[PDB]
Design a protein around this ligand. Structure first.
Ligand code: NAG
Lengths: 49, 40
């Protein structure tokens, strides 16, 4: 996603990103959610089991 | 589904070999032995 590489399951989020926010992080500084560059929807990232 | 952040960084939690429902049964057996027999 926009140069941010990773592996996981992209579900659909209830997160409400502000217009200036593209990606979110957790306490471990791993991207927990990203914004799709085209449809502008918030996807929840969770690495595979 | 989603669990936690610790679980997702290699930090797993192993269940105990003795579940609580069987530790409680061990305790109940000890109590019954104390009541029926005593220290014998
Ligand atoms: C590009 O166009 C629209 C509007 O930006 C976007 O929603 C759509 O997903 C894109 N089309 C593709 C990737 O084929």
């Amino acid at each position: 996603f926009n140069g941010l590489t990773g592996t996981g399951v992209l579900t659909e989020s209830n997160k409400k990103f502000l217009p200036f926010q593209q990606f979110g992080r957790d306490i471990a500084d791993t991207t927990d959610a990203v914004r799709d560059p085209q449809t502008l929807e918030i996807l929840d990232i969770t690495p595979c089991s | 589904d989603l669990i936690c952040a610790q679980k997702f960084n290699g930090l797993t939690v192993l269940p105990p070999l003795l579940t609580d429902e069987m530790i409680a049964q061990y305790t109940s057996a000890l109590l019954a032995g104390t009541i029926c027999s005593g220290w014998t």
